[PDB]
Design an enzyme around this catalytic site. Structure first.
Site, mmCIF file in Angstrom:
data_model
loop_
_atom_site.group_PDB
_atom_site.id
_atom_site.type_symbol
_atom_site.label_atom_id
_atom_site.label_comp_id
_atom_site.label_asym_id
_atom_site.label_seq_id
_atom_site.Cartn_x
_atom_site.Cartn_y
_atom_site.Cartn_z
ATOM 1 N N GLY A 236 46.397 98.328 -39.404
ATOM 2 C CA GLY A 236 44.964 98.150 -39.509
ATOM 3 C C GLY A 236 44.403 97.230 -40.573
ATOM 4 N N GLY A 237 44.998 96.061 -40.789
ATOM 5 C CA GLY A 237 44.321 95.128 -41.682
ATOM 6 C C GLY A 237 43.082 94.527 -41.020
ATOM 7 C CG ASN B 219 50.143 95.059 -36.383
ATOM 8 O OD1 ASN B 219 49.789 94.314 -37.290
ATOM 9 N ND2 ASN B 219 50.182 96.375 -36.516
ATOM 10 C CG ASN C 119 52.587 98.925 -38.804
ATOM 11 O OD1 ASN C 119 53.100 99.422 -39.803
ATOM 12 N ND2 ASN C 119 52.025 97.728 -38.812
ATOM 13 C CG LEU D 262 44.258 102.584 -38.618
ATOM 14 C CD1 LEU D 262 43.543 103.655 -39.426
ATOM 15 C CD2 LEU D 262 43.362 101.376 -38.413
ATOM 16 N NE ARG E 101 45.225 90.089 -39.960
ATOM 17 C CZ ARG E 101 46.321 90.838 -40.049
ATOM 18 N NH1 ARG E 101 47.457 90.413 -39.500
ATOM 19 N NH2 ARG E 101 46.274 92.018 -40.681
ATOM 20 C CG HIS F 235 51.849 98.398 -45.251
ATOM 21 N ND1 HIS F 235 52.158 99.738 -45.290
ATOM 22 C CD2 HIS F 235 50.698 98.290 -44.554
ATOM 23 C CE1 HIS F 235 51.230 100.415 -44.635
ATOM 24 N NE2 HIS F 235 50.331 99.562 -44.180
ATOM 25 C CD1 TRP F 236 51.984 94.750 -42.545
ATOM 26 C CD2 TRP F 236 52.121 92.504 -42.519
ATOM 27 N NE1 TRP F 236 50.698 94.244 -42.587
ATOM 28 C CE2 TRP F 236 50.756 92.873 -42.572
ATOM 29 C CE3 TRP F 236 52.453 91.139 -42.495
ATOM 30 C CZ2 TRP F 236 49.729 91.930 -42.588
ATOM 31 C CZ3 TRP F 236 51.438 90.207 -42.514
ATOM 32 C CH2 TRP F 236 50.090 90.606 -42.560
HETATM 33 O O1 FGZ Z 1 47.269 97.778 -42.816
HETATM 34 C C1 FGZ Z 1 46.830 98.937 -42.563
HETATM 35 O O2 FGZ Z 1 47.247 99.608 -41.598
HETATM 36 C C2 FGZ Z 1 45.778 99.551 -43.430
HETATM 37 C C3 FGZ Z 1 45.767 99.150 -44.740
HETATM 38 C C4 FGZ Z 1 44.834 99.667 -45.610
HETATM 39 CL CL1 FGZ Z 1 44.911 99.073 -47.258
HETATM 40 C C5 FGZ Z 1 43.896 100.597 -45.153
HETATM 41 O O3 FGZ Z 1 42.928 101.140 -46.035
HETATM 42 C C6 FGZ Z 1 43.920 101.005 -43.813
HETATM 43 CL CL2 FGZ Z 1 42.753 102.176 -43.224
HETATM 44 C C7 FGZ Z 1 44.869 100.478 -42.944
#
Ligand code: FGZ
Ligand code: FGZ
EC number: 3.7.1.17
Lengths: 284, 284, 284, 284
Positions: D39-40, D48, D107, D109, D186, D263-264
């Protein structure tokens, strides 16, 4: 009890003359205690321990030492692993003052110096109280460098007031503690050329071959004294996961964690910190 | 200050008359504090808190309550989720004694009862001090059941002296605390038919549909008072990893860990535990 | 693919002649992998890896080595720190077989040997796969000795069949894997005077002045190869909290954790373990 | 296999008409898997999973769903707790497509949405694969908000290109993955008034009275399916300490951690992730 009334100097030998500034208080008292401050830009003994020195001096003979590279102590342009360097300086000041075995209270960088000292001169250090200490901390979950270290490095690269404020703000849970007066004062001390000399000296020291002496989490199982680890639950420089190896391997360890508190426990929880320290060090 | 001089009774209503035994001390004092004991076989207020009640009573009006199923309190053959059941009993005793909002000190099972109480009657509980508490603990690394719970279950199945001793030995860091006198005394209390009734009642209570009320680690984010969690680093019943969810989600939490200490902090570190408690509860 | 067909012996020098037994398979294969077995009493290479060797030999040249004290390798009555002892024997076998840099797969005590080897002979070890390894694990939350370790100790003092069965039962999540045949087969091997000599030898080895060589969690930050740590969530010998230091300090580490799996990963999750190992080691 | 060829739309009912965009591939395949993206700002299903969809579609019938607020799905300006909102839309699409019990891959969110769906419609979700999921993670050691979360917040307040680039840079271990083209692509998507409406909608959704539905770490003990948690050791958004509660309380959980990964996961370790996913979901 002010900066000026408590101010003292001493000259010790660490590869040559080295001037240490320090504050002395509670001279009529029996038990001697050394305070070692944290290592931000513009950091020194007095501003670090201002909410603590008066209270501790009713029970103890307090010695709050400005570490080399900080305060009004010598800012050499070159030195080895910093905690060993500073611990050598403290060894010099101990011998000069005729101190035998003395308890150490150190936060952050100074905690690392307290630990490095206690490992290098076992007979010289008693109980340790350590607030969010560097050196013996190893962050098992937080990726390194942490947010706070990143912000410090950013200031070392681009020493602006804005960068300095950003760094000070991840030091505390209550951001209201970061006042314009505090930022201006820290910035003035930190932007002098000597302080900038000290920052390069610190940076160059990381490339040293003696880096292993800073990884004190590999060594603290050897400490025989009781050690009180004190941590803020919201510490963003040395996070709470960094306490686990020390808590496990130091035989007589204790850990106290405060919620709603950041890196500066001795400021944000000065009162609780003062009592825990007094009680742990034997009441005086 | 003895068992006999401090002994009291009260009758409260939890699905009918329920007799609660308790000890009262420091009656001239202003601040009222309730102690809730741990839940081993033969456990009761007096033996649990013997090294603590005299000291706490110099500062506080102390009420150490035998929980239903223990001591000289009623041993019903049937009850629901135990912490809710006991908390209801405590609600009854509070109203009877005219207590308003009162701080709770509970170890192990009693800690769970203190927590269950503080969630069910928010206006009735002040600060909490909790030693290796059940309920809000969830062991993130230790496989369940832990060694201590296994040994307790083994005694519930085969209530011999040998099994009882094995269980008591994983309660403490210093095994010398486990004397023949202590085992004989615990065993005598635990092998009476009423106590065995209480053990079956406890076992049947686990199959209850209200099991969720025991998983208090899902709920403690709602606690608004300061909470002091106290833990022995070598606790083999509720291990140290069990503290993490509570420390994180309880807004005003504090954690103190003692090295070289097991499940019985209030015994193995009675002195340090007494001061931390007195200080945390406001000195009296 | 049987015991006898894969049996080989070699004689190496570690302070004198030492006979190592080992199994060789998949000789036609391009890539060589050394398996190092876990360390219960009566444990050996073939028993440890039985659900694994055939599958691994389709892709790799497999060498499953009986560590000194186990199976048909020499069972000396005295030796220094075991992993360094076992690594020296392994170093000898490598030179004998003209091996270069070879990946190591070690379970438990073998994991410690594999790691100790990689630190002592950096150029000789490639990728590591390590299932619940001893040595580099340090239990940050579980009090030592762990429940699994205690059971092993009980057996060394009183090597009865009941004690061996009890030990094997804390080795696994699904206890049905512990069949009377398995207990009987292990007990036959474990109760020989030669096996009991080797077991006491191990115990005396802990009082050694070279203990520091067993604390590999201080050193694995120096490992440059990719390391796969595999752990069972319900491991009661080397609990999951033991993985954190290695996972953090080994730069190219990876961790896999299985729920509903104990200490014997390669048996209880043989299929997932085989696939995980083959892929991690390059498909062969 | 392109964006346009795999594009599909469907209209479901969540308090009124809602348009969901999604991608369908591997229609000839036996088993259906739903992918839920991270969720970026400017994030969508295709972006994604790009290094993943083609490979996954050889084994599975893939449905990669744009979550409401993202890609070409409806971007309402107001909604309740997001994962429950997104799960309701998903529930709608399931009934529309006549799906039974289907595995979910989420992934970040999306992971929270996948989990929230599995709790709200137990009969509709099978195995879960979850990369650094929000919701069921709770950061036990990292102070909230985390560094990654803070950067996202900075962007919502001041959506500049510098802020977006800074956010994407704490998403990954290897920063070279953040190309100017990627930032530009993006930023184009993220700066549309429709995208910024959806971003504020998310933020306002946190002040909701249904916040408890976002704290899924309280509920996942009820999950009966196997769950694969995948995490990067250097994840600065949902750090590794966030995995512990789920790993412990989900009975059939498994965890995989990659070092030198942020994170990715599905991008930085696309190959290992693809193989791990395919095997975990039954080879298809
Ligand atoms: O990349 C995401 O899934 C994500 C990252 C942040 Cl920092 C965030 O607050 C949310 Cl809701 C999703
Ligand atoms: O590898 C094992 O099974 C093992 C090895 C040692 Cl040295 C030990 O103490 C235990 Cl409990 C298990």
């Amino acid at each position: 009890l002010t900066f000026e009334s408590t101010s003292r100097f001493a000259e010790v030998d660490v590869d040559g003359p080295l001037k240490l500034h320090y504050h002395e208080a509670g001279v009529g008292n029996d038990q001697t205690v050394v305070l070692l401050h944290g290592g931000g830009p513009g950091a020194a003994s007095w501003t670090n321990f201002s909410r603590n020195i008066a209270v501790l001096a009713r029970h103890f003979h307090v010695l709050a030492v400005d570490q080399p590279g900080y305060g009004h102590s010598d800012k050499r342009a070159e030195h080895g692993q910093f905690n060993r360097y500073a611990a050598m300086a403290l060894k010099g000041l101990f011998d000069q003052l005729g101190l035998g075995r003395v308890p150490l209270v150190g936060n952050s960088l100074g905690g690392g110096t307290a630990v490095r000292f206690a490992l290098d001169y076992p007979a010289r250090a008693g109980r340790l109280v350590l607030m969010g200490p560097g050196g013996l901390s190893i962050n098992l979950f937080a990726p390194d460098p942490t947010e706070g270290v990143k912000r410090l490095s950013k200031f070392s690269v681009a020493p602006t007031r804005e960068n300095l404020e950003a760094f000070l703000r991840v030091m505390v849970y209550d951001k209201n503690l970061i006042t314009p007066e505090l930022v201006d004062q820290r910035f003035a001390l930190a932007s002098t050329p000597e302080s900038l000399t000290a920052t390069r000296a610190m940076g160059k020291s990381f490339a040293g071959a003696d880096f292993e002496a800073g990884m004190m989490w590999r060594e603290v199982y050897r400490l025989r004294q009781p050690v009180l680890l004190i941590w803020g639950r919201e510490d963003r420089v040395n996070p709470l996961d960094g306490a686990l190896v020390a808590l496990k391997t130091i035989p007589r360890a204790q850990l106290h964690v405060f919620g709603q508190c950041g890196h500066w426990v001795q400021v944000e929880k000065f009162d609780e910190f003062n009592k825990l320290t007094i009680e742990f060090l034997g009441g005086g």
